[PDB]
Amino acid sequence: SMSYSWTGALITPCSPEEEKLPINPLSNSLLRYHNKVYCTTSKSASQRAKKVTFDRTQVLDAHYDSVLKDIKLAASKVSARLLTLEEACQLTPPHSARSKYGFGAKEVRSLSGRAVNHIKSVWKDLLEDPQTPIPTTIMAKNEVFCVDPAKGGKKPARLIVYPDLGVRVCEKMALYDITQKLPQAVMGASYGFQYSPAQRVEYLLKAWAEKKDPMGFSYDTRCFDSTVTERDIRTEESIYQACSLPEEARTAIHSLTERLYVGGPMFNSKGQTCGYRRCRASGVLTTSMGNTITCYVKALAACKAAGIVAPTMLVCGDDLVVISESQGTEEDERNLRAFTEAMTRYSAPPGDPPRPEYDLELITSCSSNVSVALGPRGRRRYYLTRDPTTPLARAAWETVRHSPINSWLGNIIQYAPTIWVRMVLMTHFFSILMVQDTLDQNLNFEMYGSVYSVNPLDLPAIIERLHGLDAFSMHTYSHHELTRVASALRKLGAPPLRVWKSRARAVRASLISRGGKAAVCGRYLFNWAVKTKLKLTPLPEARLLDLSSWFTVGAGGGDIFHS
Known part of the structure; x- marks a missing residue:
């Protein structure tokens, strides 16, 4: 299946966008070469759209099934609860994108009548309807970089796909508690988000120290969100459902999976039909958790398939580091190629091929x-x-x-x-x-x-x-x-x-x-x-x-x- 299909309608901005760093004595005192600093805009959206659009094939095997079985077993020890509406409202960022239904984050956070009654209707609809796709908006992110003419022109804008504010609050009621308990149960110490910068360093130092002859690599998946298949997303649901949950939670999670997470129609800011997504939504609650679990399963399975010796992993979303016992120079290169071939079968093909490193400081992870x-x-x-x-x-x-x-x-x-x-x-x-x-x-x-x-x-x-x-x-x-x-x-x-x-x-x-x-x-x-x-x-x-x-x-x- 294609990660996306497109109508031809443009990805449009909400407000006018600024491409260039403005001249100003305060910012000039930091850096003078303002022409090198740029912000991504919707002008480059089509270029990005092309990059993230491709066919996915996926072939699973005994290694994959074995890791998945262990993960579901681990998840069965987790108990999670629904969050109350008020709890979920308090988790909404003050400048989260406003709803098309006449309220914004300020209203959600203060529990305004319109916001609250609307969110209640969305929740009830999630419980009653497991089927109808939920609309999303696709938008170009506005992010600032410095030019790098040794690496071509400017980066195209990243794209973000998200549902309406009312739906986002509902995701938290259904799934927030799971996000706080499940990753640690199924990935243990390999789960990267639990570590402060100092703890992350301590973890990596320990992992490196454990190996008689350490070799490490980072693995860069090409456009990870686009590589995530419908089956992957339904598998994530299966892992969530392995937890002990109240029936109402199970129902909402299933509806969210089928109506939102697995795919659905995308609209631009002008309300024109822009396309259809069949891969990971970049702007839903489960994006980070889902990416982390899915990356962990595929990577651990790929290690087994490749025969990587004693792997210790650190996974943060699509970001993956693997530290293991070196088998010699040429053997390491070969085994990394086998790892990549396995990841590719699992629908996580590489951007840049992984490179073995023999000093911890030379490994880049999460930039x-x-x-x-x-x-x-x-x-x-x-x-x-x-x-x-x-x-x-x-x-x-x-x-x-x-x-x-x-x-x-x-x-x-x-x-x-x-x-x-x-x-x-x-x-x-x-x-x-x-x-x-x-x-x-x-x-x-x-x-x-x-x-x-x-x-x-x-x-x-x-x-x-x-x-x-x-x-x-x-x-x-x-x-x-x-x-x-x-x-x-x-x-x-x-x-x-x-x-x-x-x-x-x-x-x-x-x-x-x-x-x-x-x-x-x-x-x-x-x-x-x-x-x-x-x-x-x-x-x-x-x-x-x-x-x-x-x-x-x-x-x-x-x-x-x-x-």
């Missing part, structure tokens, strides 16, 4: 890699980092165009120990917050497919909780990091690190002069910037932080909110 620096007392300290180009480009965009989602804050939190966060992002944004005089304002950001709300003044505590006090004392960064970061800054026309250091001294001093939590930020976040460093003591606030909802599977399109 990140492990690096090492020194903490206080000169101990080696491993931490997660990434190339800063995209985070810098988005930070410049977000400096001049305010967005409901602050990617820069998510980056500061996730990549706090990195030299680029500490010297550049932290310095720039605390500067900008004082310029705006909005330091003490909660901001939203996306992390692991979920939306969170954080006050920047709480960052020392948050950073301490997630990364430890060492995140404020790290030094002697790797040659690779210094080189990669300096090169990104030059490429974007940003000031060099030495300039950021002088800037941070003044930001630090300004924050300290404001006293209170602002002074705590100055002292902790910018201790690296002064010659006479302060002694940083554990923050009592770090322990009081309720991070119980951090680091879990999220939702397609990040359409879930925790506060």
Whole structure:
């Protein structure tokens, strides 16, 4: 079957879109080469539509069946419940796309009569009708990147397919509790979303250490969502139904599967019939959970089919890392080819063929890699980092165009120990917050497919909780990091690190002069910037932080909110 069929109708935008980074003295102080920064628009939607449209064949085998049997057995130990309407409403992000039925996220979150009565009607209809396909909207995402002329032109916009807001709330009532219990039961420690950045590093270090002679690879499936077949999606349902659930939950889950998850008609923003989907919807609740389970099953089966020796996996949606015992250079290459052939049979063909690596730091997963620096007392300290180009480009965009989602804050939190966060992002944004005089304002950001709300003044505590006090004392960064970061800054026309250091001294001093939590930020976040460093003591606030909802599977399109 084809992943999509199309009518010829265009994928259209809601509002006018901005393609180019606007000139502005605040964003210019971060980076000058504004012509290199672009935002994807609906102008490139047809190009993407072509890429994600292809035939899927799927041939399963004994290895696949064996893994699937184990998974269903594991799921049978899980008990899940429905969420109340009110619980599901509270999980809706404040800027989630409004319903076509006369209400938005604000109404849902405040439980307005129209929103509530509508959602009740949608729920009842889910229970009564397991058959009629539920309409979805297809939209081009607006995401910011830096040009890469060594890799062709600009990336085409990603596409997102999602149902109406009323349906999205119903998905949470039916399936949210499952998203919070099932992945850990069936994938155990291989499930990546349960780990903070520091824990992810610890997991990978352990996995690597376990092997007498470790070899690792990442596997890139070509357009994973499009490779997911109707059978795959019905199999996911079978796994959900293996849980102990109330009958009403079983009914809603089945209707959602047949009417929404397995496929259905897509409409553009103008309401014209755009096409029909026969693969994974990118913007439904189960997108992340479904991708993770389906990727785990196919990958583990492919390991068995290939004869990979003692595999330890880390799976986050379509993102897959496999660490195992090396069988020798040529044997490893051969076995990776056999793994790829198996994944291909299972309908998960590769983008770039996997490459064996024999050093953990050389494996890229979820766009990140492990690096090492020194903490206080000169101990080696491993931490997660990434190339800063995209985070810098988005930070410049977000400096001049305010967005409901602050990617820069998510980056500061996730990549706090990195030299680029500490010297550049932290310095720039605390500067900008004082310029705006909005330091003490909660901001939203996306992390692991979920939306969170954080006050920047709480960052020392948050950073301490997630990364430890060492995140404020790290030094002697790797040659690779210094080189990669300096090169990104030059490429974007940003000031060099030495300039950021002088800037941070003044930001630090300004924050300290404001006293209170602002002074705590100055002292902790910018201790690296002064010659006479302060002694940083554990923050009592770090322990009081309720991070119980951090680091879990999220939702397609990040359409879930925790506060």
